[PDB]
Design an enzyme around this catalytic site. Sequence first.
Site, short mmCIF file in Angstrom:
data_model
loop_
_atom_site.label_atom_id
_atom_site.label_comp_id
_atom_site.label_asym_id
_atom_site.label_seq_id
_atom_site.Cartn_x
_atom_site.Cartn_y
_atom_site.Cartn_z
N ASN B 132 -39.22 -60.96 47.75
CA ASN B 132 -39.86 -60.72 49.04
C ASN B 132 -38.99 -60.80 50.29
O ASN B 132 -39.18 -60.03 51.23
CB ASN B 132 -41.16 -61.53 49.20
CG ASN B 132 -40.95 -63.03 49.16
OD1 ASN B 132 -39.89 -63.53 48.75
ND2 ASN B 132 -41.98 -63.76 49.56
N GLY B 212 -40.20 -68.96 44.27
CA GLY B 212 -41.08 -68.00 43.62
C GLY B 212 -42.43 -68.58 43.24
O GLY B 212 -42.94 -69.46 43.92
N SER B 213 -43.00 -68.09 42.15
CA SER B 213 -44.37 -68.47 41.80
C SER B 213 -44.50 -69.94 41.38
O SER B 213 -43.61 -70.51 40.75
CB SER B 213 -44.97 -67.54 40.74
OG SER B 213 -44.66 -67.94 39.42
N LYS B 215 -46.53 -71.21 39.21
CA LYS B 215 -46.63 -71.29 37.75
C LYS B 215 -45.24 -71.38 37.12
O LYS B 215 -45.02 -72.20 36.23
CB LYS B 215 -47.41 -70.08 37.21
CG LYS B 215 -47.24 -69.82 35.70
CD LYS B 215 -47.97 -68.54 35.24
CE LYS B 215 -47.12 -67.27 35.40
NZ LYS B 215 -47.74 -66.12 34.64
N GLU B 232 -39.26 -73.98 45.81
CA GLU B 232 -39.95 -73.43 46.96
C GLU B 232 -41.01 -72.48 46.40
O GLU B 232 -40.70 -71.34 46.04
CB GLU B 232 -38.94 -72.70 47.85
CG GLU B 232 -39.47 -72.20 49.18
CD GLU B 232 -38.36 -71.84 50.14
OE1 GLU B 232 -37.66 -72.77 50.62
OE2 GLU B 232 -38.19 -70.64 50.43
N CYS B 266 -44.75 -66.53 50.74
CA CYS B 266 -45.27 -67.82 50.25
C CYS B 266 -46.12 -68.55 51.31
O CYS B 266 -47.02 -69.31 50.94
CB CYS B 266 -44.16 -68.71 49.74
SG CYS B 266 -42.98 -69.07 51.01
#
Lengths: 455, 456, 456, 458
Positions: B132, B212-213, B215, B232, B266
């Site tokens: 992103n 990132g994600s 999960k 992060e 995010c």
Amino acid sequence: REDMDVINPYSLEVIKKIPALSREEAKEAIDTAEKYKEVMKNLPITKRYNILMNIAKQIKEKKEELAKILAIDAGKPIKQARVEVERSIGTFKLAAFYVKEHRDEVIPSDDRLIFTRREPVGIVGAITPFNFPLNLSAHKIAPAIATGNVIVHHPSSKAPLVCIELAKIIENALKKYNVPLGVYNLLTGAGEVVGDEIVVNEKVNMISFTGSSKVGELITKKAGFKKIALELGGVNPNIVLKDADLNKAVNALIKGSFIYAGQVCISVGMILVDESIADKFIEMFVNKAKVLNVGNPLDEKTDVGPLISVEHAEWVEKVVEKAIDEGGKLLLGGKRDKALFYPTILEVDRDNILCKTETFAPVIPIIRTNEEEMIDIANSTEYGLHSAIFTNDINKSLKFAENLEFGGVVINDSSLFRQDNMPFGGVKKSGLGREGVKYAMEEMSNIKTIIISKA
Amino acid sequence: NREDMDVINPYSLEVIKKIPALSREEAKEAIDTAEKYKEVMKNLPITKRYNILMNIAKQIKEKKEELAKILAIDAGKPIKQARVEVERSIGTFKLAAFYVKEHRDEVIPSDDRLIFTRREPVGIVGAITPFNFPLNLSAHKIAPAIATGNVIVHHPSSKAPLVCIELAKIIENALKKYNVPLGVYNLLTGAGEVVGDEIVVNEKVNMISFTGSSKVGELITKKAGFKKIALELGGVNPNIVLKDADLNKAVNALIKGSFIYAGQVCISVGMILVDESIADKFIEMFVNKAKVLNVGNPLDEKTDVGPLISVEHAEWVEKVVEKAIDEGGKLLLGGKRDKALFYPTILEVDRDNILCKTETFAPVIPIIRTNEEEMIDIANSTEYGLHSAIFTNDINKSLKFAENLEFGGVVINDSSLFRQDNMPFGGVKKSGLGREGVKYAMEEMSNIKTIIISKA
Amino acid sequence: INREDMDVINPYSLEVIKKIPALSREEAKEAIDTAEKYKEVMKNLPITKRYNILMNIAKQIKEKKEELAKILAIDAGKPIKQARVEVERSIGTFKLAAFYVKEHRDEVIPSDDRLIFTRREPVGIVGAITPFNFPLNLSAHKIAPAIATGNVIVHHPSSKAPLVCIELAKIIENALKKYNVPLGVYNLLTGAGEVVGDEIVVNEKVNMISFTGSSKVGELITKKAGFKKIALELGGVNPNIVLKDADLNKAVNALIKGSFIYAGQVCISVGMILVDESIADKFIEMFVNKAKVLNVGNPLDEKTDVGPLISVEHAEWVEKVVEKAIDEGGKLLLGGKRDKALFYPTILEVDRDNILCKTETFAPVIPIIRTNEEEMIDIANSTEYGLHSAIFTNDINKSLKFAENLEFGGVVINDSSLFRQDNMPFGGVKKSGLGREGVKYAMEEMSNIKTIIISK
Amino acid sequence: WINREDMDVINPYSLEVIKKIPALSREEAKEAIDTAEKYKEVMKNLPITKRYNILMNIAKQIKEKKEELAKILAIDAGKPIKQARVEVERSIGTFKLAAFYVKEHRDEVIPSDDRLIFTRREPVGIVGAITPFNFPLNLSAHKIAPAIATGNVIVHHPSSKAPLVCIELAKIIENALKKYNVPLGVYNLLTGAGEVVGDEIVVNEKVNMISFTGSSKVGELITKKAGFKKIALELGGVNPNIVLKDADLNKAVNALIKGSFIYAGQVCISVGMILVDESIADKFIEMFVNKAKVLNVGNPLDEKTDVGPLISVEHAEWVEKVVEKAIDEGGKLLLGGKRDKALFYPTILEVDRDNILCKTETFAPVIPIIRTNEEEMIDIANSTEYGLHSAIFTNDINKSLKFAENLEFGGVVINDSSLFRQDNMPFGGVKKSGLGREGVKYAMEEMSNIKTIIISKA
């Protein structure tokens, strides 16, 4: 309940029997702790200050009683026990200071006020060792309270009694200032049950563990999504250059080698000595080690008390046997009376088992070497807690200080040095994070960044 | 030189080009190689680190428009926003240069001892960066790592890797210029679950810094082992509008927070909580501003909102919107999609709606009208804790909310989307570990050494 | 010495309590020469010893708390409940100094092949000149940091309430003896300010002057001190601003405290209240009503809210200022009454041009100006002073605007100008001061930096 | 007044008048200060981004004019061209560091129950900067850059002995201000007689702070005349450099040659005396004289020149007299002691601790060497009224620390001469050598006032 034997390592008598919590009981205590997170988080500065100061007051008032408990339960010579008690008083007092003084920051911005705020991580899981069970508990508990955390604390079963006394002291302080007792929880029992549950439980927000490197490594694999602080051990190399003040190096190294029978994470693990002075050093060091008083920790004259268990003392014996088998030369000791292990000194080469093994014992390998090989030998282990160099040479001291792969480097005193208010910890397999109250408080809190946008 | 993996223009869906995809075994080899350069990086002088960092910034500046165009084509980022990202990345590298010279160590008082600290590299930093803001978020890991004398193994997101390949060439140019072996920085492209995973798991890597994600971050904590870890991650970021908010200002701020980079940030707005007394006026104003946004080609100067990163993601978002409408969500705007181009979408929902607990990374905004005494509870009700925001002119309420919001960042009178690059930045709960911002990342990417000189 | 030269007065009864030595200039010079002999001893005193001395001073103060409080009441005319608070603060000040001896941090600056670090060293002889109003804690605020930083001290206390300082001097002597430090490291010099205090200021052996008192005297000191470090904590006409949206009950209670604590004889006492026209009537009524019921009388009485001014002379002067304020068109709302040194809470409504808006009265005399918001910053900043200001408001933007634009060393939001947390940096701008107090800040003023560079 | 040709500006090597510049009257100085006052609000409210941009653009312009500015230093200040280039490079760094500190300087939050307590730095107001002839570009940068960074208006008097580079810097500052739409009145270069223009800046009640770099005698008078102002002073000293018997002699000699002879000794931290252990004194002296012998003394414009002229014939004549006195007192001349107008040759004498040179700051390439025992060294080093920099050469840990702690100086350099200053370090003197510390971050703190803001919570 009276589940688990607590042993006097000198006499081998059962001192008493304490509770050993099941995993389900440990889970219950953690659930209880979770219910008090809000109360702790909102506790005013003045209240945390008062609690910490009152804890220090009670420790001071019971100083001799606590020192005696360290002597009987941990096998710690009474003079050394008194020092540990005094340090624990300092630790609680310093945390009280930092509740009031710890600084947050403002960051410049056009038309915005940007500032930081520290907030508790939540539940701190504190897992403390047998060797300095009072001050090392103070080094986790004091910053945890200072930062508004709830605590679940498992002490070593090998010397839990001083921690039981500290828990009562904490309970008294909490009662005095009208704080529910559930904010602090002492959980005794098997490490692989109670300690394990603290590590694994998803309600615990942070693990702060001091103890063996093996266990620390296992924690990194089992802890999951938690903040982690580890204070582990190592084979701490102490280097004596050809220009060192030999008398002062010997005295420093006697202390670093034999304080608490070598059962300190920063104890001397190997001495590297320049070949040109090796004979003189070795003679002086052996002669000083000979005259140490070995025996009952309760005796005022005792320099060296017993190891924490017979099982450990038996293991050390086999290691010394293996070291001699590899060609190590026995210069002193190598004798054992149950758990009482006598100061033991060998000359070995860099390939000896003792150069790679943390013995937690008064067993000191000496390697004669040239200057060019010292850094490589010193850095050759999987650990990196403390190292030391004895020299009067500016250039050499700085070169060694830069190149030694250690969390601490001590110049002209042994590896055993720790000033309680300094940042303290290891690199490589010796640790994560730093202790010392200010530093622990930083690990035991999370930053919040607040931005006020101006019209 | 291998042409393994398609790189896609998320607007046109065309394959831009094919890049290498490393195997796990190739990643292990690269890490092994990087290990060899730990000593050279550790001993690089301050002046040389400073010079490398400044030269990286110089080169990015020189290629500013080119790099911005790549972000538009590869990441789907509207050109005006891409230029902003490039400018930030210049700043990030320059700030790292400043800190190599300025970062302070300390002396601890002691009778007859000199006690001081020294920072040293952690060793190999494994940097895993997102699609992103792949330029500046790479800068936020690379710049501090170089500054602190670490070797770097870097896996960029395969969804927008091209700008990272250009940054890697730039870093290579700087290293060559100052006679530093190229092996100190290593860009490893390929499947996240192969290359990224190897970086996470490999015992030679000393530190993982992942953005990132949530999960994936959670899984990293279970697989990393004995490493320093910085994460992060994301969240469903609550933005709170009180009775007394300046409505024009809050609308404008929340338009930005909701729709910048099509909500693929995010810290994007994940929900708006609005006081019941002003909800009608707020919602009308907010929908009306969102209506006039230019949706289309990121290369166009006038474009406000570009596509989502993939058709696959856009299809998933569509499903979530459908489910949100199923549960009683009221569609006020959008809810339409042209391939990956997802239109600004706004719904009124209640706190139980799927959108209130799902990070969509999409221009999809749930609005809950509620009363003040409920707001903190709804805000704090997720597993996440990245950013939150409150719009109010009330001192007591702003402080109450600021203290009680369980978040890494609390923004007053601007949206959750706010981040000044030099601030400590990060999340609590399942939203992160550690803080970024160059000064803070440097602290995570180094270990303290305590040095004690015992005096006569 | 054992001389009985100078009357010490009880400001309530106007009786002579006792007579104390009044040192000649030659005797002051002699004391400074003595102090000079002990600079090397103090400079080398270990941290542990400084910590021990400072903690023992705190211990003794604590043990004599009630006695010390009674002395403040009899000598300074301070109501006993307020006297206890001062003693309590002074214990904290010595303790905080003890902890900073241990914790004060120096820095290390990055350099290729050089270790650069700082070391703080004493300025040498600290000349401390302390006021009558908080003679114990304000003495602690100079003495405690001086000892912590390894300085010798020459200390002149105000002749208007010297007795508690004589007691503190004995406490200091006891601590010094306990830890085997020569008594000459700390020297209390009593007598005329313009003789003894002046010698401290002028003497070329004194290395730093720290003075708390009148702005007039402070200005003189800048012209007479010569080549010395100078710290000044002076006074001001401290403006307290009540915006239309203030919590009026809270503002009134806060302003009663700020106006009438220690009969207004505090450098940060309320000097003027500016109140929005829209709420002026309601505010004035509430404020006058609360002031009406204050108990004015003997400071030894537990009931007493307001004791006497420090001298008849000063009270006579305040009365003339009040007369002049009335002449100018001031409207007397309460008090104006005087019984010897006992001055009753006095409140006037005035305009911005009144003598009271420009005059520090050190008295329970409160001018109230009704005004509009846009005139408030200008009125507040219109004096030659700049110590503390306060604003009462619930509005974020207004509070931030006033905080930035008020030309003051301190800005208090939603409490009066009288607020000082002892551990905060404290002091004034314009003619109100130089430097900051609070132990950590005073320690910096009372030391010099040494930069040490080790070239590798 | 900008067109006025009032005051001669001299090339110290040729003694030719380079040009004539304006000399402001006291009344013109008063007017400049009154006008500066009018822009205090504008400067105080300039955004961070604007300050940053202005500082960066000043740095950019200095960099683009590097060679030109270096030549001006050579011609006007008599500074060897190689050393001039180094000063210019430092000045670029000083402006850039101020730019980053505008963005990075930190304020603090203090814990409190139900109160938010935080600090804010605000400008002192009008900063009166008075700068010296010797490093007129970088020492101006060390006052201007932090002043701009902290939101102050500036009135700046440069030394009339080498003002031309300061006139050039003023034009550069003017260009930056214009570029970013800031009134020119925020920065004011005031040329003329120090005793008129400098004096007015010191005494004027509208000036909020004085920052002066120059002679200790002038600094002392500033303390007596400034009144109610913040005061920062960077003065001089007789800086002792100590060579212990275990020192690396080759390294010590090289370091001390630089420290002794850079800018002909006209540096506040120039070597003022060398104390050398008796046991090694002969070898050290021989090595030191031999290296000093081969220095190229001459035209500062020549790339080969190591040592240029002193700033004036007047000063050189005075230095000559002091050397004569030193010899009269029994000093042994080992090298030099010769003058060609203002061109003063490297001069070395062996003297005892009581010699005039041990107490006199000569700002000249004149080096007294005193042979002594180790235990006398700290007392000799500390025996002056000054306390700027000191140095010690030794390989002994314990001795280095003992000397470092016991030397009564603002700076102690181990294994390099007193001349060392890293621009980002806190820099300054104790005793009669100073008040306050310079270095951008430190000057910014001196040039601002703290405001403590307390938000009381319900």
